[PDB]
């Protein structure tokens, strides 16, 4: 997250931190995710496509810091890693960029709700907030271009939804952005998601309820003028989510 604020997991209790264990035994942070039901985390296929071996991943819930323990945190393995069969990647754009992780503790248990672990609501079919709506993004991604390590503390920011018409302008993304994607940015280009925030939530109030509207997917640079963050439009993928869970 470029700009924004440091946060804590109690303020983002659906947030899942996804890591990968490497040959040799080191663990690195991969991407964010969102808990949509006790056994299911939703994320982005691009986070896993190059290393689609589920045994290598570790999922934490209730965790506020990248390399320190948070009281109440729960660690999970991935019982089932479901990537979208029609996923593809262009120079900038990622398509059908959505993934499901069925999570399981070593005891076989799913998430147990607490102060720091909660599910996030899915939207209804075809129902997104109007453009101009302020929404929140959360993650452990880069804070500036020169970062070579991800920040130790979880961050959040607030961005505004941008219409498809605006996002497809020639100096934005042209026809590279589709109606299965949502754009969002800071009107002054001062805050944005960035590398490492992928897979994490774009959360909006929709009929007074916190709703998973998007999944961080792609964008040129970070907080770059006329280059919005692009998010998988969760409301278009409900049939896929329903059939695969």
């Amino acid at each position: 997250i470029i700009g924004g604020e440091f946060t804590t997991i109690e303020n983002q209790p659906w947030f899942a931190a996804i890591y990968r264990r490497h040959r040799g035994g080191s663990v690195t942070y991969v991407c964010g995710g969102s808990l949509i039901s006790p056994c299911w985390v939703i994320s982005a296929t691009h986070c896993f496509i190059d290393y689609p071996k589920k045994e290598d991943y570790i999922v934490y819930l209730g965790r506020s810091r990248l390399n320190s323990n948070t009281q109440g945190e729960m660690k999970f393995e991935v019982e089932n890693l479901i990537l979208h069969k029609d996923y593809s990647a262009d120079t900038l754009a990622h398509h059908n960029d959505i993934a499901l992780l069925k999570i399981r503790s070593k005891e076989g248990r799913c998430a147990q709700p607490s102060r720091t672990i909660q599910t996030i609501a899915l939207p209804s079919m075809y129902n997104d907030p109007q453009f101009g709506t302020s929404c929140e993004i959360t993650g452990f991604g880069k804070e500036q271009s020169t970062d070579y390590l991800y920040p130790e503390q979880l961050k959040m920011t607030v961005v505004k939804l941008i219409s498809h018409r605006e996002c497809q302008q020639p100096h934005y993304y042209g026809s590279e952005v589709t109606t299965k994607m949502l754009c969002a940015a800071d009107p002054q280009w001062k805050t944005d998601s960035c590398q490492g925030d992928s897979g994490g939530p774009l959360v909006c109030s929709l009929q007074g309820r916190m709703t998973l509207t998007g999944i961080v997917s792609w964008g040129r640079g970070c907080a770059l003028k006329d280059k919005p963050g692009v998010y998988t439009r969760v409301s278009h993928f409900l049939p896929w989510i329903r059939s695969h869970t």
Binding site: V30, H46, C47, A89, C194, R220, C222
Partner: peptide, 13 residues
């Protein structure tokens, strides 16, 4: 190869 959102955990990052 590629940098930024979309490129995490890739060999071409």
């Amino acid at each position: 190869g590629x940098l930024g959102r979309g490129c995490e955990n890739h060999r071409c990052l």
